[PDB]
């Protein structure tokens with residue numbers, strides 16, 4: 351028999367080389383729809399995958415964060431020399447309100463609660479916007495070959511910094527650690543914090559008959 355192979359459950363996952371591919375439909379209760387995900391290929395620190403979705407309702411509420419998460423031991427920033435990454439992706443769908451973003455977390459201890467979250471958005475689609483206490487940038491730095499718009503704002507007892515590419519970026523390669531150095535140098539983030547999480551995926555708000563194709567994604571820590 352041939353069956354649907356994509357996984358669709360709220361907390362379903364797949365293991366793929368150095369990655370976990372999470373469905374992470376954490377916000378599904380905020381609306382109506384569904385989301386199914388699958389691995390296409392993998393080899394060590396590289397993965398190709400896709401996700402398709404339709405979400406309605408809860409227009410300002412994220413429904414999910416399907417993502418490829420690197421398996422690694424939490425490491426203090428001052429022990430990291432570079433985090434090379436490459437990401438090639440494309441989106442299809444209608445009325446897509448979503449981002450394509452890295453999601454990363456810093457904590458005082460390896461097993462402890464997060465203190466900072468750092469997102470790096472390669473795309474803001476359909477008017478999607480980052481968490482921001484003002485609605486405006488705090489800085490507009492050039493990092494890893496891209497001109498970014500940096501925002502900040504709270505999420506519970508954490509501060510979220512979001513670097514948003516000036517233009518939609520379907521193909522990206524550079525050193526993700528440059529974003530952590532930037533915040534250590536410019537925003538008072540301690541270089542003694544542990545990087546606990548390195549994820550790359552998409553946050554949908556609303557849209558229909560959407561599909562993200564990640565043709566290539568790689569990341570490592572040196």
Ligand SMILES: OC[C@H]1O[C@@H](O[C@H]2[C@H](O)[C@@H](O)[C@H](O[C@H]3[C@H](O)[C@@H](O)[C@H](O[C@H]4[C@H](O)[C@@H](O)[C@H](O)O[C@@H]4CO)O[C@@H]3CO[C@H]3OC[C@@H](O)[C@H](O)[C@H]3O)O[C@@H]2CO[C@H]2OC[C@@H](O)[C@H](O)[C@H]2O)[C@H](O)[C@@H](O)[C@@H]1O
Nearest residue numbers: 361372374376412414415417419453467481505506510553
């Ligand atoms: O009992 C059911 C199963 O629970 C699983 O645990 C889940 C928790 O119940 C969820 O609370 C948790 O949701 C978080 C999710 O993993 C993150 O991806 C998401 O990150 C947000 C971030 O908060 C936001 O600041 C940033 O802008 O955007 C990212 C991406 O969307 O955050 C979720 C929680 O925060 C939101 O909800 C609470 C609000 O107060 C807050 O404002 C919201 O933002 O997810 C876990 C599962 O997470 C794990 O798997 C998915 C991975 O992607 C993730 O990294 C892993 O930690 C249990 O694990 C299961 O065993 C249970 O069956």
